[PDB]
Amino acid sequence: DIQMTQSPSTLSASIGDTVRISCRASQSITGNWVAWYQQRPGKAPRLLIYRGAALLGGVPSRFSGSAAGTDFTLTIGNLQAEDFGTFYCQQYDTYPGTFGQGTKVEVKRTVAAPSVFIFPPSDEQLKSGTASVVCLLNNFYPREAKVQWKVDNALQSGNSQESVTEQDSKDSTYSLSSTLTLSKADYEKHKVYACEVTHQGLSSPVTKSFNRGE
Amino acid sequence: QIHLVQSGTEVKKPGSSVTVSCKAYGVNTFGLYAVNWVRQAPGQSLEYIGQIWRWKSSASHHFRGRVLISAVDLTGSSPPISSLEIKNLTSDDTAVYFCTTTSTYDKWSGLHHDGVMAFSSWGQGTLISVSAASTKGPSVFPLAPTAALGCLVKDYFPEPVTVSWNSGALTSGVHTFPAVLQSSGLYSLSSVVTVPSSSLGTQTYICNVNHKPSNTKVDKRVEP
Amino acid sequence: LENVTENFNMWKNNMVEQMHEDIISLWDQSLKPCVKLTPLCVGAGSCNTSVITQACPKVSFEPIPIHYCAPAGFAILKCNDKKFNGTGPCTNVSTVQCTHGIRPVVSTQLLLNGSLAEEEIVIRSENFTNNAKTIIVQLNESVVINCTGAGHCNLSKTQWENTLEQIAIKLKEQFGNNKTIIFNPSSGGDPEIVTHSFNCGGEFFYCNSTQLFTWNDTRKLNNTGRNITLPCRIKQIINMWQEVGKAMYAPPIRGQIRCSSNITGLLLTRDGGKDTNGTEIFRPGGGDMRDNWRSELYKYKVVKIE
Amino acid sequence: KKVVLGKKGDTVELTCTASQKKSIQFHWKNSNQIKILGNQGSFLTKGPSKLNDRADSRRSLWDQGNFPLIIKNLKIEDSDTYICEVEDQKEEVQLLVFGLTANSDTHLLQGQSLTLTLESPPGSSPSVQCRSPRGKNIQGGKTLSVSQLELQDSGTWTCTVLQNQKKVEFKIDIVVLAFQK
Ligand SMILES: *[C@@H]1O[C@H](CO)[C@@H](O)[C@H](O)[C@H]1NC(C)=O
Ligand SMILES: *[C@@H]1O[C@H](CO)[C@@H](O)[C@H](O)[C@H]1NC(C)=O
Ligand SMILES: *[C@@H]1O[C@H](CO)[C@@H](O)[C@H](O)[C@H]1NC(C)=O
Ligand SMILES: *[C@@H]1O[C@H](CO)[C@@H](O)[C@H](O)[C@H]1NC(C)=O
Ligand SMILES: *[C@@H]1O[C@H](CO)[C@@H](O)[C@H](O)[C@H]1NC(C)=O
Ligand SMILES: *[C@@H]1O[C@H](CO)[C@@H](O)[C@H](O)[C@H]1NC(C)=O
Ligand SMILES: *[C@@H]1O[C@H](CO)[C@@H](O)[C@H](O)[C@H]1NC(C)=O
Ligand SMILES: *[C@@H]1O[C@H](CO)[C@@H](O)[C@H](O)[C@H]1NC(C)=O
Ligand SMILES: *[C@@H]1O[C@H](CO)[C@@H](O)[C@H](O)[C@H]1NC(C)=O
Ligand SMILES: *[C@@H]1O[C@H](CO)[C@@H](O)[C@H](O)[C@H]1NC(C)=O
Ligand SMILES: *[C@@H]1O[C@H](CO)[C@@H](O)[C@H](O)[C@H]1NC(C)=O
Ligand SMILES: *[C@H]1O[C@H](CO)[C@@H](O)[C@H](O)[C@H]1NC(C)=O
Ligand SMILES: *[C@H]1O[C@H](CO)[C@@H](O)[C@H](O)[C@H]1NC(C)=O
Question: Which residues constitute the domain of residue B151?
């Protein structure tokens, strides 16, 4: 099958910008049998351009398609609010048709360090036999962030999960949750619980912590 | 104007089989439009499954022998319908399945190249979630305290749950995170709010949680 | 046959519009009215009527078959299948020089002397779901119908009874088997659409098709009648099919006008009903002569050379 | 989502326009998808609708890409949301049929009150406002009245039915009287 490798994985832009997304096919496509789609979070993709450069009926002309050698690129002029989201390229030169991995286009903003908070398990949860420790990172930009869990100073692996909101429509920031889960038994055993966060906005990795029972 | 209307969400046990449907409003006859089915696993890109073109059906290598695709012309009571049958479901079949249509009437169009094509109309998608879990209402736990506070909505199935604060009167500064799927095969999510530290003993905060598939509704007061 | 897979859309076929426009011009030099009235508005509501008076030569307009051969830089593609929706990807396509001989018969409600359905009775529709889109029925066995300027047409009650059945059965086989199929006369509208209108000997016949479309999926109507007799009427003042406007043709004169055509198809149009209990009501339709042309070009499509 | 108001017993014209000036396929249906009347190219097709014998378009305007839907002898019940499926567009237009009918004879003694009743469709809340021959701008949503029918009101009254940016006149004659001089 033909492989389509898409570039870059994410890019940040402003309203009114011109943006370029590229896709390299693993073989030449003489016929220009390539298509571009947009997908907004929660919705079905929409066809924007087909045959490399042809605009589908109803698609704004600020979208255009181009090709050179094995590379195909989508250009977006005068970037608009409804344009943000994820874009995919597709070859239909040879069976079966295949898609690129996709490109996320998000809103550019000044750097903002997360506000960081940590929540011990509630007494009600402890009563029901489980313990969840939650760390919150609120309203930060850019999205890239690392959070590590330490208990009794020991790095925690495989017992945590993270969740990230969509980029906020009004302040263009992200928020993120990390939840550390363990048995009521181990929770009651150890003393200090710590969330360690690293982010561009932070001159140095910030640690929020508590001692069980304070 | 073409609107493709797919059948609703299904929750299916491993080993089971399912059939998803697509009503093609605005489509004359599948003699003039090809149907292509496509799926998208969560946080993944898109993958071609198979097609029916000129009343001739077929499936990609990865799905051959496991999938039947059919289409029938109808009128009056219903528009033309296509369906996709999938046998022996496993966890890696969990995804959003899209039905898709492309006119084949004009050979010169450039939407299609000898049966391989771009997809000009899309359905909303249907989620097929493959799981042995049985329906279960959540537990709700307080996340007690500019300060932050919230609610942990733990161990429910299936999606979705909805969360408001103070019956909807508090919306500014509220973040309700996408659910995560735990190792137990049950979901969990949290909802948080940031508030001024000053009002903490003056103002009341309650999260209203609704899980309709289990008919569960809880109202949890969150206190310092 | 051509070894390739292409798209077809009789409902958006361009040859239809190319023939239609031809058939119209085949009418402007064969059947010329004594007077032709046509709307003329600037947009300001007020609309004067443009009148035209020319000679009114009585000619026995007898349609000649028409072929359609692709010139150069162009090729016609024919679809092959015993049951083709005429709107999708055709598998057994095949390039042809000229389309079969087609006799541009202009009529409403019934398609005369068209081309029969090879296999069985087929019914195409740009959308059967839409109670606004004409349903073009294609008979696999024509039903002779003889009209005369004497004032009527005779049809076989037998053949017509069967036909409504083998049509009524193909309908529910598209709208739901567990659905009752009924046939009622025109709902209303222009004389040309409400009755089975058509032209014979240059005379515009208007046959009342009530006995042809009042079939209940229960009873019959062959008491003391061997043949169906539609009370037809020839009009001089008619609404034009070529374009909004009336047109007056000179009275009949030939000692006798007669027609014997093959009911090779119909143009039905079921009523919405707003999703009411299985009781689809289909009535005569047509008036948009293109559907006609369509019923003949449903399996064709001219394309540019490569 | 256009809206038109009409007076019971009058003729209203729900418009519907095609992009270009070309007589093309169009069709008038009501909320229940019941076909009112469309066109068969150059012919007019009237559907099953109860508005059949009272529905009608304007052939002449079809060429100017115009395909109205005139409804005559308008009935309160004729009030509805008539779609107009044209060239894949659904120009859903609204139709409200109000009916102002005074109670007691136009002839009414002096002083007594004058009661007006506005017949209207369900889910419809218009706001009427008649204007005496002198100037009484008295208001009445559905049912108005003139507390004390003063002798200077005995004459033509100009009401008005407000419903979504639109309104319909309803001139009414009123006659005040005496004991005599
Ligand atoms: C799944 O299909 C396979 C062949 O694809 C067959 O061997 C097997 O019996 C099926 N499994 C079930 C549970 O039906
Ligand atoms: C009648 O139609 C003509 C168009 O030829 C227009 O110019 C004129 O204003 C209309 N009024 C008359 C003359 O009746
Ligand atoms: C089609 O025609 C054949 C004979 O030509 C007839 O036997 C068959 O029943 C028809 N199909 C129907 C019922 O539409
Ligand atoms: C119609 O006329 C033909 C001769 O052209 C005759 O064979 C046939 O029986 C007639 N059909 C009727 C009157 O049913
Ligand atoms: C018709 O509907 C289904 C077929 O889809 C059938 O099982 C049912 O018994 C029938 N019911 C009616 C409408 O009579
Ligand atoms: C003939 O048609 C008229 C309307 O065109 C209808 O009212 C009348 O009842 C019909 N007569 C017959 C033959 O039943
Ligand atoms: C259809 O049914 C009605 C009433 O049941 C009857 O009056 C009418 O004659 C029937 N149509 C015919 C003639 O088959
Ligand atoms: C009904 O009438 C037709 C002729 O009009 C006749 O051929 C048929 O046998 C009659 N029905 C029966 C079987 O009595
Ligand atoms: C076509 O119509 C004539 C006129 O009645 C008929 O005699 C002839 O057999 C028909 N031929 C066809 C198309 O079968
Ligand atoms: C073909 O149909 C036309 C209807 O316009 C009829 O006048 C003609 O006689 C038919 N063919 C024959 C048998 O002449
Ligand atoms: C279908 O028949 C009528 C349609 O007018 C409806 O009132 C009824 O509920 C439906 N079912 C019956 C009683 O046959
Ligand atoms: C015709 O047969 C050849 C066999 O080599 C095949 O390549 C081609 O796709 C076929 N065309 C049709 C009818 O689809
Ligand atoms: C078209 O080709 C298919 C594939 O072999 C064959 O089944 C069909 O009979 C052909 N149709 C005709 C008769 O042209």
Answer: 133-223
